[PDB]
């Protein structure tokens, strides 16, 4: 694709607006947007987690207006925010008291907030904390895990092309690919880490590269991808579950001629 | 269709007011505090007391009568939290940090939020626990389903009343609010330090990327705020939300529009 001039005019520009619900594991309907309580394995050798215990990458493939009868939709600007940040102030619902007579323990600890806009499926690289971890039937995970899978194994390449499938802890955006995607992610690890969530409708991310070219939507398809593990909920018994929230996306696209 | 800005002596006006916090106000002695927080036994039996739920504050300020067709356009905001130094009262009915120690200062989960708009702030509902029973006198997500815990598009509302919209049910709807600028930060966690800056030298510009600010329909400016500063632990160990008032100063100018 040799990129040429941008189309101008009333009909040269379009907008895509949607939300991605979180895939935290959903152990029963009462706990939608939570993971299952986290079990710790006895040894590295015998680590076989339940499927509803593994948060997954969320993905949306949004069809854009048909262009052919050579134009492509170019993603220019993104607006995004986490939906329902104030829900984390429910500190009265089945929590563990901070101390005697105290309010509930609020959602806190390890968090991963991540969003991507691209003209093709997000490209993943596999890295495993423990290579002998047995990921469950129904998830897509690094196959033929060797000892070198714990630092870097180039065999573990995949496309984020399915929901409730790619576990967060196996997969990261592949920095060797993703030429046609813009991705942003922050892991704030630790056990007592405060969530810091900003909301505003005044903040815009520009998706153009150093050459002034944004993601080009192949087959007139925009690929939105997100993870928002806000932290962990401690319930009365002391058990801890991941809690996640949906993510709003608004993408401005424009028609671009290519050769 | 937005056209030229009016100039001249009489082309510009100013709105200055404070919004008191609605923290719950369990008795007159505790104005600007919530009731002590009860933790429920299960998710299914969570029925909080009305005076335990902080609420969005809102002010609808009439502007000079105008109206070929002029509207007041909000250009610049100055805002700050009033009474930040009150959180140094560490000698009044608190729980000692340790033996012979000073009181425990207000700390933990905080949500600071302010909005300026030409119409009521538009709200989206997200529930921590969908089976939470919100009390008569509050306005909350009706017909809560399982999907209400992540995203249910049925839960749309207007912040059109005081002491009514609980903070933990409602967030600004990012799908609407074209005619509002909103800013919010949740700093969750149990021991989180409040960080409150005050200055009369800081100005927020409310103009969008096209140089257009919020247009006040019916000559009405809509100010909205939440300032849950954290929690007060009293001698017994029980914890109450503490909030503070918010100053607003909005500079508006006359703008001609069409239709």
């Amino acid at each position, epitope marked *: 694709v040799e990129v040429l001039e941008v189309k101008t005019g009333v009909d040269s520009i379009t907008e895509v607006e949607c939300f991605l619900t979180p895939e935290m594991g959903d*152990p*029963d309907e009462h706990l939608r947007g939570f993971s299952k309580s986290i079990s710790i394995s006895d040894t590295f050798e015998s680590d076989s987690p*339940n499927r509803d215990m593994l948060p997954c990458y969320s993905v949306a493939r949004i069809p854009l207006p048909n262009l052919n009868e050579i134009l492509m939709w170019e993603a220019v600007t993104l607006k995004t925010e986490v939906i329902g940040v104030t829900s984390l102030m429910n500190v009265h619902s089945n929590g563990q008291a901070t101390h005697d007579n105290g309010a509930g323990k609020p959602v806190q600890g390890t968090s991963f907030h991540f969003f991507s806009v691209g003209g093709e499926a997000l490209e993943l690289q596999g890295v495993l904390f423990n290579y002998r971890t047995k990921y469950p*039937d129904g998830t897509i995970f690094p196959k033929n895990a060797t000892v070198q899978s714990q630092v870097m194994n180039t065999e573990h390449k995949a496309y984020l092309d399915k929901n409730k499938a790619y576990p967060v802890e196996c997969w990261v955006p592949d920095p060797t690919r993703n030429e046609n995607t813009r991705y942003f992610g922050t892991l704030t690890g630790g056990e007592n880490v405060p969530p810091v969530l900003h909301i505003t409708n005044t903040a815009t991310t520009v998706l153009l590269d150093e050459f002034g070219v944004g993601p080009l939507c192949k087959g007139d398809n925009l690929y939105l991808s997100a993870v928002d593990v806000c932290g962990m909920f401690t319930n009365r018994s002391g058990s801890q579950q991941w809690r996640g929230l949906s993510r709003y996306f608004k993408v401005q696209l424009r028609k671009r001629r290519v050769k | 269709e937005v056209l030229e800005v009016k100039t001249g002596v009489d082309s510009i006006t100013e709105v200055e007011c404070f919004l008191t916090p609605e923290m719950g106000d369990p008795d007159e002695h505790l104005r600007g505090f919530s009731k002590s927080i009860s933790i429920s036994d299960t998710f299914e039996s969570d029925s909080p007391n009305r005076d335990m739920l902080p609420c969005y504050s809102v002010a609808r300020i009439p502007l000079p009568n105008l109206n070929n067709i002029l509207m007041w356009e909000a250009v610049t905001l100055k805002t700050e939290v009033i009474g930040v130094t009150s959180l140094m009262n560490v000698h009044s009915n608190g729980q000692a940090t340790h033996d012979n120690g000073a009181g425990k200062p207000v700390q933990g989960t905080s949500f600071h939020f302010f909005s300026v708009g030409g119409e009521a702030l538009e709200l989206q509902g997200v529930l921590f626990n969908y089976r939470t029973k919100y009390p008569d006198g509050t306005i909350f997500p009706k017909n809560a389903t399982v999907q209400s815990q992540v995203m249910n598009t049925e839960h749309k509302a207007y912040l059109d009343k005081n002491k009514a919209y609980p903070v933990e049910c409602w967030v600004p709807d990012p799908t609407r609010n074209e005619n509002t600028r909103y800013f919010g930060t949740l700093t969750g966690g149990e021991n989180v330090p409040p960080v409150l800056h005050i200055t009369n030298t800081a100005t927020t510009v409310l103009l969008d990327e096209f140089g257009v600010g919020p247009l006040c329909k019916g000559d009405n400016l809509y100010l909205s705020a939440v300032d849950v500063c954290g929690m007060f632990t009293n001698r017994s160990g029980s914890q109450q939300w503490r909030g503070l008032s918010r100053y607003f100063k909005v500079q508006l100018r006359k703008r001609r529009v069409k239709n």
Partner: single-chain antibody
Amino acid sequence: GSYVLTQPPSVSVAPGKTARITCGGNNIGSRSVHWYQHKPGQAPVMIISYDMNRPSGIPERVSGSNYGNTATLTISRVEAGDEADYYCQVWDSRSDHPYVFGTGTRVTVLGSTGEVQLVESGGGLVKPGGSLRLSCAASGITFQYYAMNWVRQAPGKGLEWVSSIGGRGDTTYYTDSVKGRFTISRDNSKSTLYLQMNSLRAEDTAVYYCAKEPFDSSGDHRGVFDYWGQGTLVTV
């Protein structure tokens, strides 16, 4: 053919001693294995999911592993109560036999021998070539978010998966031995699962069990039966 799970027909242990039920499978170690306990007359309970995970209720005594060409259930401090049939089960999404059960292991002890409900109807006597409608009335769950299944146990034989349906009724799968004859369906509003069994043969006589899968936002298949109905016997 199908994937094959081989189990020892029977195992004997004294009270206190530990019991080991093996589940042999061609590279079973790279598949998630689930274990079901079944006492005669009662609803099967899931005791292990995803190789080694214990549901609320099942004690620490019960233990699961899965490594080589063999997965292993281990009941450690054995009691009279532990006497039952134990089945291992795997899931092969996208194959002609998606839900595969082991042949079953009967454990004998040689010392001195309620939010979710699934209520079943429709069973009884019917003649060869005749019809019959099984129903399973769920309560306490939003039905459309749960893939549902029919499993049967012929007199003498072990558990055999019969049919599976998605939460929205989108996906339908059958065993090769019932393809053109049995039809599975749902009424999410009435919150019940149906099996329309017509053109019935003699080898269909079995206790028909209603089997629920774990919650899924789409009502997708997950390959585990986390709760069972008490079962209904069809004879011919």
